[PDB]
């Protein structure tokens, strides 16, 4: 089944985690009033290329999916496995972490790939 | 997390039918499944079936298979997230040992192996069956 770019926006999050490799599809595409489609076309590769600097900084590089060491704070909105890939929609999600999005990115930009690849030049030179 | 209001309890004699509401607000209503689980004094608790929403599709008991109909409104939008509903059900044929406090309850989850599982219930509805 292919529900399209933003399929499953009401669907629960395990639901929609089978539609990644859509939205990221559709993500990139490919005299005045010819200006107005060239800075919007421009301002969406750089919207592009900082999610992409964003992800690429973190522990996963290999887009759609990645694994990281951080533990889940409960105080994250302190949820179940069960109640939030089977019961919330990534809208509704989002809604409760926007407080702590900038606060996780902190603990995955300068945490993980700083202390880790420090850690693996130190254990490639033996 | 949303809040469930039954109808008042009716006093219905045997032979005639009865329609019992349940209506629901402060989560989205097609979402979750409305199960109808009765209690009698004399049978125990007792699930009667449940209805889907966003579909229609229903799902009764054999013992209610050829007597209870169940229907759903549509569902009224508040927020994005949350909504106000309304769930009916009419038993007809009614009996002596058809007394007894009738529930809703609401889904427990949207996927899995327990979507249907009656999670928040009501208040219920006493019904009595008496000439």
């Known amino acids: 089944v292919f529900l399209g770019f933003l399929g499953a926006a009401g669907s629960t999050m395990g639901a929609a985690s089978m539609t990644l490799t859509v939205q990221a599809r559709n993500l990139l595409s490919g005299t005045v009033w010819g200006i107005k489609q060239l800075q919007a076309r421009v301002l969406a590769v750089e919207r592009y290329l900082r999610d992409q600097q964003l992800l690429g900084i973190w522990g996963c590089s290999g887009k759609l999916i990645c694994c990281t060491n951080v533990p889940w704070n409960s105080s994250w909105s302190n949820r179940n496995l069960s109640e939030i890939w089977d019961n919330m929609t990534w809208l509704q999600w989002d809604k409760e972490i926007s407080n702590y999005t900038q606060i996780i990115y902190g603990l995955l930009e300068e945490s993980q790939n700083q202390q880790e690849k420090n850690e693996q030049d130190l254990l490639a030179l033996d | 997390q949303g809040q469930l209001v039954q109808s008042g309890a009716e006093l219905k004699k045997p032979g005639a039918s009865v329609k019992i509401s349940c209506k629901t607000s402060?989560?989205?209503?097609?979402?979750?499944?409305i199960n109808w689980i009765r209690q009698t004094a004399g049978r125990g608790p007792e699930w009667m079936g449940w209805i889907s929403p966003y579909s229609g599709d229903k799902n009764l008991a054999p013992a209610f298979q050829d007597r209870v109909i169940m229907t759903t409104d549509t569902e009224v939008p508040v927020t994005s997230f949350t909504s106000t509903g309304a769930a009916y059900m009419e038993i007809r044929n009614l009996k002596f040992d058809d007394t007894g406090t009738y529930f809703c309850?609401?889904?427990?989850?949207?996927?899995?192996?327990?979507?249907?599982?009656?999670?928040?219930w009501g208040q219920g509805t006493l019904l009595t069956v008496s000439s």
């Open positions: 309850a609401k889904g427990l989850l949207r996927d899995g192996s327990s979507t249907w599982l009656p999670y928040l």
């Open positions: 402060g989560y989205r209503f097609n979402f979750y499944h």
